[PDB]
Amino acid sequence: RGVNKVILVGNVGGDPETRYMPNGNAVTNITLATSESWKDQERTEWHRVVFFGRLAEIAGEYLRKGSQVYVEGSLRTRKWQGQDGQDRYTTEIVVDINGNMQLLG
Amino acid sequence: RGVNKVILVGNVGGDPETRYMPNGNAVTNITLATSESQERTEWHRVVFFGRLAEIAGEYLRKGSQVYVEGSLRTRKWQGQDGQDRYTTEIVVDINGNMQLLG
Amino acid sequence: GVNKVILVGNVGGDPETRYMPNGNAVTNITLATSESWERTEWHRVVFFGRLAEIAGEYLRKGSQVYVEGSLRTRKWQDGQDRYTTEIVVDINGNMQLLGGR
Amino acid sequence: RGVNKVILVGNVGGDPETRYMPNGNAVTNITLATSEERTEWHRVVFFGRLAEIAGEYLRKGSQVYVEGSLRTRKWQGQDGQDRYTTEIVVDINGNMQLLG
16 A cells, blocks of 8 residues: 655675575575764664565675675564563564665675 | 665554754654555654654644655664663655655 | 666546557556646656556546656657657556555 | 655766856766666766765766656757757755765
8 A cells, every 4th residue: 555665775784694494485684784974973774684585595695794785675673572571673674576686886 | 875765655643743852853753554465564663853844743644645755763762671672763854755645 | 787766746647558569558657746946847657567557447637646667768760869768667666546545 | 746766776887077157056967877688878967066976986887876856858959859858867855875
Protein backbone atom coordinates (compact mmCIF):
# COMPACT_ATOMS: atom_id res chain seq x y z
CA ARG A 1 0.00 0.00 0.00
CA GLY A 2 2.89 2.36 0.77
CA VAL A 3 6.52 2.89 -0.16
CA ASN A 4 9.44 1.84 2.06
CA LYS A 5 12.77 2.69 0.47
CA VAL A 6 16.28 3.31 1.77
CA ILE A 7 19.27 4.43 -0.29
CA LEU A 8 22.74 4.31 1.25
CA VAL A 9 26.25 4.95 -0.05
CA GLY A 10 28.74 4.01 2.62
CA ASN A 11 31.77 2.02 3.75
CA VAL A 12 31.61 -1.59 4.93
CA GLY A 13 32.60 -1.68 8.59
CA GLY A 14 33.84 -5.24 9.01
CA ASP A 15 34.35 -8.47 7.16
CA PRO A 16 30.95 -9.38 5.70
CA GLU A 17 29.33 -12.34 7.45
CA THR A 18 27.70 -14.78 5.05
CA ARG A 19 25.36 -17.57 6.12
CA TYR A 20 23.25 -20.20 4.36
CA MET A 21 19.76 -21.49 4.98
CA PRO A 22 18.98 -25.23 4.75
CA ASN A 23 17.69 -24.66 1.19
CA GLY A 24 21.01 -23.14 0.09
CA ASN A 25 19.96 -19.49 -0.13
CA ALA A 26 22.52 -17.01 1.17
CA VAL A 27 22.24 -14.28 3.81
CA THR A 28 25.02 -11.72 4.21
CA ASN A 29 25.23 -9.21 7.05
CA ILE A 30 27.30 -6.03 7.08
CA THR A 31 27.44 -2.77 8.90
CA LEU A 32 27.63 0.29 6.70
CA ALA A 33 28.85 3.70 7.89
CA THR A 34 27.64 7.03 6.51
CA SER A 35 28.87 10.26 8.02
CA GLU A 36 28.48 14.04 8.06
CA SER A 37 30.99 16.87 8.63
CA TRP A 38 30.79 20.02 10.74
CA LYS A 39 32.58 22.97 12.37
CA ASP A 40 31.98 25.18 15.44
CA GLN A 41 33.01 17.58 14.18
CA GLU A 42 31.81 14.26 12.70
CA ARG A 43 28.64 12.20 13.15
CA THR A 44 28.71 8.65 11.79
CA GLU A 45 25.60 6.55 11.28
CA TRP A 46 26.13 2.80 11.49
CA HIS A 47 23.52 0.96 9.44
CA ARG A 48 22.77 -2.76 9.73
CA VAL A 49 22.40 -4.08 6.19
CA VAL A 50 21.19 -7.59 5.37
CA PHE A 51 21.41 -8.98 1.84
CA PHE A 52 19.37 -11.97 0.68
CA GLY A 53 19.80 -14.28 -2.25
CA ARG A 54 22.03 -13.43 -5.19
CA LEU A 55 23.06 -10.05 -3.80
CA ALA A 56 23.98 -11.88 -0.59
CA GLU A 57 26.37 -14.06 -2.60
CA ILE A 58 27.95 -11.11 -4.42
CA ALA A 59 28.17 -9.18 -1.14
CA GLY A 60 29.74 -12.06 0.77
CA GLU A 61 32.31 -12.63 -1.94
CA TYR A 62 33.42 -9.15 -3.02
CA LEU A 63 32.84 -6.79 -0.07
CA ARG A 64 35.72 -6.11 2.32
CA LYS A 65 36.24 -3.86 5.30
CA GLY A 66 36.24 -0.32 3.87
CA SER A 67 34.47 -1.29 0.66
CA GLN A 68 32.43 1.62 -0.69
CA VAL A 69 29.00 0.35 -1.67
CA TYR A 70 25.64 1.59 -2.95
CA VAL A 71 22.66 -0.16 -1.39
CA GLU A 72 18.94 0.18 -2.08
CA GLY A 73 16.55 -1.69 0.18
CA SER A 74 13.77 -1.33 2.70
CA LEU A 75 13.51 -0.76 6.43
CA ARG A 76 12.55 -3.61 8.73
CA THR A 77 12.32 -3.43 12.51
CA ARG A 78 12.59 -6.87 14.13
CA LYS A 79 11.17 -7.41 17.61
CA TRP A 80 12.86 -9.71 20.12
CA GLN A 81 12.76 -10.53 23.84
CA GLY A 82 16.14 -9.97 25.45
CA GLN A 83 17.50 -12.41 27.98
CA ASP A 84 16.16 -10.19 30.78
CA GLY A 85 12.66 -10.66 29.30
CA GLN A 86 12.01 -7.13 28.00
CA ASP A 87 11.29 -6.26 24.40
CA ARG A 88 14.02 -4.90 22.17
CA TYR A 89 13.91 -3.73 18.58
CA THR A 90 16.42 -3.85 15.74
CA THR A 91 16.01 -1.77 12.56
CA GLU A 92 17.78 -3.21 9.51
CA ILE A 93 18.02 -2.32 5.82
CA VAL A 94 16.87 -5.40 3.93
CA VAL A 95 18.42 -5.79 0.48
CA ASP A 96 16.67 -8.56 -1.47
CA ILE A 97 15.34 -9.16 -4.99
CA ASN A 98 13.44 -5.86 -4.81
CA GLY A 99 16.56 -3.89 -3.81
CA ASN A 100 19.92 -3.20 -5.35
CA MET A 101 23.62 -3.17 -4.55
CA GLN A 102 26.48 -1.73 -6.58
CA LEU A 103 30.17 -2.12 -5.73
CA LEU A 104 31.75 1.31 -6.14
CA GLY A 105 35.29 2.47 -7.03
CA ARG B 1 31.04 10.83 3.48
CA GLY B 2 28.19 8.93 1.83
CA VAL B 3 24.45 9.10 1.28
CA ASN B 4 21.77 8.35 3.90
CA LYS B 5 18.31 8.58 2.31
CA VAL B 6 14.91 7.18 3.30
CA ILE B 7 11.79 7.62 1.14
CA LEU B 8 8.46 6.62 2.67
CA VAL B 9 4.88 6.77 1.51
CA GLY B 10 2.55 5.78 4.32
CA ASN B 11 -0.25 6.65 6.73
CA VAL B 12 0.23 8.58 9.98
CA GLY B 13 -0.52 6.35 12.95
CA GLY B 14 -1.92 8.96 15.31
CA ASP B 15 -2.32 12.66 15.86
CA PRO B 16 1.08 14.37 15.54
CA GLU B 17 2.99 15.23 18.72
CA THR B 18 4.51 18.69 18.37
CA ARG B 19 6.87 20.04 21.01
CA TYR B 20 9.48 22.76 21.18
CA MET B 21 13.11 22.85 22.14
CA PRO B 22 14.66 25.44 24.49
CA ASN B 23 15.86 27.36 21.41
CA GLY B 24 12.24 27.52 20.23
CA ASN B 25 12.48 25.31 17.15
CA ALA B 26 9.66 22.86 16.46
CA VAL B 27 9.90 19.09 16.77
CA THR B 28 7.05 16.88 15.54
CA ASN B 29 6.90 13.12 16.10
CA ILE B 30 4.71 10.69 14.16
CA THR B 31 4.56 7.02 13.37
CA LEU B 32 4.10 6.08 9.73
CA ALA B 33 2.77 2.75 8.50
CA THR B 34 3.89 1.25 5.20
CA SER B 35 2.37 -2.04 4.13
CA GLU B 36 3.06 -4.54 1.37
CA SER B 37 0.74 -7.08 -0.25
CA GLN B 38 -1.10 -11.56 2.67
CA GLU B 39 -0.23 -8.15 4.20
CA ARG B 40 2.75 -7.05 6.34
CA THR B 41 3.11 -3.60 7.91
CA GLU B 42 6.27 -1.72 8.90
CA TRP B 43 5.95 1.00 11.52
CA HIS B 44 8.40 3.87 11.15
CA ARG B 45 9.36 6.44 13.78
CA VAL B 46 9.49 9.78 11.94
CA VAL B 47 10.73 13.01 13.52
CA PHE B 48 10.32 16.41 11.84
CA PHE B 49 12.51 19.40 12.60
CA GLY B 50 12.13 23.09 11.95
CA ARG B 51 9.76 24.32 9.27
CA LEU B 52 8.62 20.88 8.14
CA ALA B 53 7.99 20.27 11.84
CA GLU B 54 5.43 23.10 11.98
CA ILE B 55 3.80 22.07 8.71
CA ALA B 56 3.59 18.45 9.87
CA GLY B 57 1.98 19.40 13.18
CA GLU B 58 -0.32 21.83 11.36
CA TYR B 59 -1.66 19.64 8.56
CA LEU B 60 -1.07 15.97 9.44
CA ARG B 61 -3.72 13.96 11.30
CA LYS B 62 -4.08 10.31 12.27
CA GLY B 63 -5.31 9.30 8.84
CA SER B 64 -3.11 11.25 6.48
CA GLN B 65 -1.14 9.61 3.69
CA VAL B 66 2.21 11.38 3.46
CA TYR B 67 5.45 11.29 1.48
CA VAL B 68 8.53 11.56 3.66
CA GLU B 69 12.15 11.94 2.59
CA GLY B 70 14.67 11.89 5.40
CA SER B 71 17.76 10.28 6.90
CA LEU B 72 18.19 7.38 9.29
CA ARG B 73 19.48 8.24 12.75
CA THR B 74 19.86 5.64 15.51
CA ARG B 75 19.85 7.45 18.83
CA LYS B 76 20.77 5.85 22.15
CA TRP B 77 18.74 6.28 25.32
CA GLN B 78 18.68 4.74 28.80
CA GLY B 79 15.80 2.76 30.27
CA GLN B 80 14.46 2.67 33.82
CA ASP B 81 17.11 0.11 34.86
CA GLY B 82 20.20 1.79 33.40
CA GLN B 83 20.12 -0.49 30.34
CA ASP B 84 20.96 0.70 26.84
CA ARG B 85 18.19 1.18 24.30
CA TYR B 86 18.39 2.31 20.68
CA THR B 87 15.68 3.74 18.44
CA THR B 88 16.23 4.20 14.71
CA GLU B 89 14.31 7.24 13.51
CA ILE B 90 13.73 8.76 10.07
CA VAL B 91 14.84 12.38 10.52
CA VAL B 92 13.13 14.95 8.24
CA ASP B 93 14.74 18.39 8.27
CA ILE B 94 15.92 21.02 5.78
CA ASN B 95 17.66 18.33 3.71
CA GLY B 96 14.53 16.14 3.54
CA ASN B 97 11.00 16.65 2.27
CA MET B 98 7.41 15.99 3.24
CA GLN B 99 4.35 16.12 1.00
CA LEU B 100 0.79 15.61 2.18
CA LEU B 101 -0.86 13.36 -0.41
CA GLY B 102 -4.45 12.96 -1.61
CA GLY C 1 25.85 2.27 -12.15
CA VAL C 2 22.46 3.35 -10.79
CA ASN C 3 19.64 4.94 -12.80
CA LYS C 4 16.60 5.68 -10.67
CA VAL C 5 13.69 8.11 -10.94
CA ILE C 6 11.03 8.59 -8.25
CA LEU C 7 7.92 10.64 -9.14
CA VAL C 8 4.77 11.60 -7.28
CA GLY C 9 2.38 13.51 -9.52
CA ASN C 10 -0.90 13.64 -11.43
CA VAL C 11 -1.72 11.75 -14.62
CA GLY C 12 -1.90 14.35 -17.36
CA GLY C 13 -4.42 12.57 -19.58
CA ASP C 14 -6.01 9.21 -20.13
CA PRO C 15 -3.34 6.53 -20.68
CA GLU C 16 -2.46 5.34 -24.18
CA THR C 17 -2.11 1.55 -24.36
CA ARG C 18 -0.65 -0.31 -27.34
CA TYR C 19 0.64 -3.83 -27.86
CA MET C 20 3.99 -4.92 -29.28
CA PRO C 21 4.29 -7.72 -31.86
CA ASN C 22 5.16 -10.35 -29.25
CA GLY C 23 1.95 -9.12 -27.59
CA ASN C 24 3.38 -7.30 -24.57
CA ALA C 25 1.57 -4.18 -23.39
CA VAL C 26 3.05 -0.68 -23.48
CA THR C 27 1.25 2.20 -21.77
CA ASN C 28 2.26 5.84 -22.16
CA ILE C 29 1.21 8.61 -19.77
CA THR C 30 2.37 12.08 -18.92
CA LEU C 31 2.84 12.90 -15.25
CA ALA C 32 2.80 16.44 -13.85
CA THR C 33 4.96 17.37 -10.85
CA SER C 34 5.13 20.96 -9.62
CA GLU C 35 6.81 23.18 -7.04
CA SER C 36 6.01 26.61 -5.56
CA TRP C 37 8.69 29.10 -4.52
CA GLU C 38 4.62 27.79 -9.94
CA ARG C 39 6.57 25.53 -12.34
CA THR C 40 5.15 22.23 -13.61
CA GLU C 41 7.41 19.55 -15.06
CA TRP C 42 5.66 17.23 -17.54
CA HIS C 43 7.24 13.78 -17.37
CA ARG C 44 6.92 11.23 -20.17
CA VAL C 45 6.30 7.89 -18.45
CA VAL C 46 6.26 4.58 -20.35
CA PHE C 47 5.09 1.40 -18.60
CA PHE C 48 6.00 -2.09 -19.85
CA GLY C 49 4.49 -5.50 -19.18
CA ARG C 50 2.28 -6.12 -16.16
CA LEU C 51 2.38 -2.50 -15.02
CA ALA C 52 1.42 -1.40 -18.54
CA GLU C 53 -1.86 -3.34 -18.39
CA ILE C 54 -2.55 -2.08 -14.86
CA ALA C 55 -1.74 1.49 -15.85
CA GLY C 56 -3.93 1.50 -18.93
CA GLU C 57 -6.79 -0.25 -17.10
CA TYR C 58 -6.95 1.77 -13.88
CA LEU C 59 -5.20 5.15 -14.26
CA ARG C 60 -7.21 8.16 -15.38
CA LYS C 61 -6.53 11.81 -16.05
CA GLY C 62 -5.87 13.37 -12.68
CA SER C 63 -5.01 10.14 -10.86
CA GLN C 64 -2.34 10.72 -8.20
CA VAL C 65 0.39 8.10 -8.61
CA TYR C 66 3.81 7.17 -7.33
CA VAL C 67 6.19 5.91 -9.99
CA GLU C 68 9.65 4.38 -9.74
CA GLY C 69 11.66 3.70 -12.87
CA SER C 70 14.74 4.60 -14.82
CA LEU C 71 15.69 7.24 -17.38
CA ARG C 72 15.88 6.25 -21.05
CA THR C 73 16.55 8.73 -23.85
CA ARG C 74 15.00 7.36 -27.04
CA LYS C 75 16.11 8.31 -30.55
CA TRP C 76 13.63 8.90 -33.37
CA GLN C 77 13.23 10.88 -36.61
CA ASP C 78 11.36 15.20 -41.16
CA GLY C 79 14.60 13.20 -41.49
CA GLN C 80 16.19 15.09 -38.58
CA ASP C 81 17.19 13.45 -35.31
CA ARG C 82 14.82 13.86 -32.36
CA TYR C 83 15.29 12.65 -28.79
CA THR C 84 12.80 11.94 -26.00
CA THR C 85 13.90 11.25 -22.41
CA GLU C 86 11.32 8.87 -20.90
CA ILE C 87 10.82 7.42 -17.42
CA VAL C 88 10.68 3.71 -18.13
CA VAL C 89 8.66 1.71 -15.57
CA ASP C 90 8.94 -2.05 -16.30
CA ILE C 91 9.50 -5.12 -14.03
CA ASN C 92 12.36 -3.28 -12.19
CA GLY C 93 10.13 -0.29 -11.40
CA ASN C 94 7.03 0.32 -9.28
CA MET C 95 3.73 2.16 -9.70
CA GLN C 96 1.21 2.82 -6.95
CA LEU C 97 -2.08 4.63 -7.21
CA LEU C 98 -2.10 6.94 -4.25
CA GLY C 99 -4.81 7.34 -1.62
CA GLY C 100 -6.98 4.65 -0.12
CA ARG C 101 -8.02 3.66 3.39
CA ARG D 1 3.07 19.70 -5.10
CA GLY D 2 4.44 16.29 -6.17
CA VAL D 3 7.92 14.76 -6.06
CA ASN D 4 10.57 14.91 -8.78
CA LYS D 5 13.71 13.01 -7.82
CA VAL D 6 16.50 11.35 -9.82
CA ILE D 7 19.34 9.31 -8.33
CA LEU D 8 22.29 8.41 -10.56
CA VAL D 9 25.59 6.64 -10.05
CA GLY D 10 27.79 6.75 -13.09
CA ASN D 11 30.98 7.94 -14.73
CA VAL D 12 31.63 11.47 -15.94
CA GLY D 13 31.96 11.39 -19.72
CA GLY D 14 34.09 14.49 -20.30
CA ASP D 15 35.88 17.09 -18.27
CA PRO D 16 33.29 19.25 -16.47
CA GLU D 17 32.34 22.60 -17.98
CA THR D 18 32.10 25.28 -15.28
CA ARG D 19 31.22 28.94 -15.63
CA TYR D 20 30.57 31.63 -13.02
CA MET D 21 28.04 34.40 -13.48
CA PRO D 22 27.55 37.83 -11.91
CA ASN D 23 25.32 37.00 -8.91
CA GLY D 24 27.89 34.52 -7.60
CA ASN D 25 26.01 31.52 -9.02
CA ALA D 26 28.13 28.88 -10.76
CA VAL D 27 26.94 26.33 -13.32
CA THR D 28 28.69 23.07 -14.09
CA ASN D 29 27.73 20.77 -16.95
CA ILE D 30 28.67 17.13 -17.34
CA THR D 31 27.42 14.04 -19.10
CA LEU D 32 27.11 10.93 -16.96
CA ALA D 33 27.04 7.37 -18.25
CA THR D 34 25.05 4.73 -16.40
CA SER D 35 25.09 1.17 -17.72
CA GLU D 36 23.05 -1.87 -16.72
CA GLU D 37 25.87 -3.80 -21.52
CA ARG D 38 23.58 -0.93 -22.54
CA THR D 39 24.87 2.53 -21.59
CA GLU D 40 22.60 5.50 -20.92
CA TRP D 41 23.93 9.05 -21.20
CA HIS D 42 22.55 11.70 -18.85
CA ARG D 43 22.92 15.47 -19.07
CA VAL D 44 23.61 16.67 -15.51
CA VAL D 45 23.70 20.34 -14.57
CA PHE D 46 24.91 21.54 -11.17
CA PHE D 47 24.03 24.96 -9.75
CA GLY D 48 25.47 26.89 -6.83
CA ARG D 49 27.83 25.36 -4.28
CA LEU D 50 27.52 21.92 -5.87
CA ALA D 51 28.51 23.38 -9.25
CA GLU D 52 31.66 24.74 -7.59
CA ILE D 53 32.43 21.38 -5.97
CA ALA D 54 31.65 19.45 -9.17
CA GLY D 55 34.01 21.63 -11.21
CA GLU D 56 36.79 21.30 -8.65
CA TYR D 57 36.62 17.55 -7.97
CA LEU D 58 35.00 15.87 -10.98
CA ARG D 59 37.13 14.94 -13.98
CA LYS D 60 36.54 12.79 -17.05
CA GLY D 61 35.93 9.21 -15.92
CA SER D 62 35.20 10.15 -12.28
CA GLN D 63 32.62 7.95 -10.57
CA VAL D 64 29.97 10.09 -8.88
CA TYR D 65 26.64 9.87 -7.08
CA VAL D 66 24.13 12.50 -8.10
CA GLU D 67 20.68 13.31 -6.73
CA GLY D 68 18.58 15.88 -8.50
CA SER D 69 15.35 16.72 -10.31
CA LEU D 70 14.24 16.33 -13.91
CA ARG D 71 13.90 19.46 -16.01
CA THR D 72 12.90 19.61 -19.67
CA ARG D 73 13.73 22.87 -21.44
CA LYS D 74 12.26 23.93 -24.78
CA TRP D 75 14.26 25.62 -27.54
CA GLN D 76 13.80 26.54 -31.20
CA GLY D 77 16.52 25.06 -33.37
CA GLN D 78 18.17 26.95 -36.22
CA ASP D 79 15.73 25.29 -38.63
CA GLY D 80 12.93 26.91 -36.60
CA GLN D 81 11.54 23.64 -35.19
CA ASP D 82 10.84 23.10 -31.51
CA ARG D 83 13.26 20.85 -29.62
CA TYR D 84 13.41 19.65 -26.02
CA THR D 85 16.31 18.80 -23.72
CA THR D 86 15.79 16.88 -20.45
CA GLU D 87 18.48 17.49 -17.82
CA ILE D 88 19.10 16.33 -14.26
CA VAL D 89 19.28 19.53 -12.22
CA VAL D 90 21.49 19.20 -9.12
CA ASP D 91 21.03 22.26 -6.92
CA ILE D 92 20.53 23.00 -3.21
CA ASN D 93 17.72 20.43 -3.04
CA GLY D 94 19.99 17.78 -4.53
CA ASN D 95 23.23 16.09 -3.65
CA MET D 96 26.52 14.99 -5.11
CA GLN D 97 29.12 12.60 -3.72
CA LEU D 98 32.43 11.90 -5.43
CA LEU D 99 33.01 8.16 -5.28
CA GLY D 100 36.02 5.85 -5.38
